[PDB]
Paper text:
The Lys48-linked Ub chain serves as a tag for protein degradation by the 26S proteasome, whereas the Lys63-linked Ub chain is involved in nonproteolytic functions, such as signaling in DNA repair and transcriptional regulation. The proteins that recognize the specific Ub chains interact with a hydrophobic surface, which includes Leu8, Ile44, and Val70 of Lys48-linked Ub. In contrast, the crystal structures of Lys48-linked Ub chains often exhibit closed conformations, in which the hydrophobic patches are shielded due to Ub-Ub interactions in the chains.
We prepared the n-triUb and n-tetraUb in native and cyclic forms by in vitro enzymatic reactions and chromatographic separation. In contrast, the spectrum of c-triUb was significantly different from that of c-diUb in terms of the chemical shifts of the peaks originating from the hydrophobic surface and the segment linking the Ub units. We determined a crystal structure of c-triUb at a resolution of 1.33 Å. As expected from the NMR spectra, c-triUb adopts a three-fold symmetric structure in which the hydrophobic surfaces, including Leu8, Ile44, and Val70, are partially exposed, distinct from the closed conformation observed for c-diUb and c-tetraUb.
Numbering used by the authors:
A (entry chain B), B (entry chain C), C (entry chain A): 1 to 76
The structure:
């Protein structure tokens, strides 16, 4: 299925994914497409911060959903 | 009066507003223009997060001010 | 050495620096190139918000590192 990821650089990136894909998997796809290290990526869906070990299914992310890519902030 | 709203991508939206307008009103204006649900919009002025029930004049947002539209981050 | 800085919208700035440069020094370099007042700059490295009185060395920022500008948020 496809989802879309909006970047601060003004891009909408289409990704081919499955419900069972982890957020880690999605970040790896973004690295392939956009060259951004996964450890600097934060994904947002309807305001919610998506955790690496959860799946798209876990967040009820369905076909043609839009995510936003923002900078991951860590503290320290 | 006019204010300017910069999106995450740096696009400037020009809005016709009034000093007594609420932030909720301004977000409705962005929805009508851009189709972003107000629920998903966060506005920032000079670093400060703007609350929906307060007015532009409450925040000393004057003619020709610039706001930033960012994601309305939430738990869950 | 050289480092890179990404603007709010992902433009890349190249800076000449030394390890002993303070973050305040870096922000002055950014002001000279981009015009952004230092008091409005917030720099991130490895997800961490950088403090003006600390140095690049203090953050283990080495040659060819990338920093990001993000919107400077405040309370009130
Ligand atoms: Zn499969
Ligand atoms: Zn957006
Ligand atoms: Zn009126
Ligand atoms: Zn700004
Ligand atoms: Zn970046
Ligand atoms: Zn020197």
């Amino acid at each position: 299925m496809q989802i879309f990821v909006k970047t601060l650089t003004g891009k909408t990136i289409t990704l081919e994914v499955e419900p069972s894909d982890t957020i880690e998997n999605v970040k790896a796809k973004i690295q392939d497409k956009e060259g951004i290290p996964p450890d600097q990526q934060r994904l947002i869906f309807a305001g919610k911060q998506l955790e690496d070990g959860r799946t798209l299914s876990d967040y009820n992310i369905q076909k043609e959903s839009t995510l936003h890519l923002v900078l991951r902030l860590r503290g320290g």
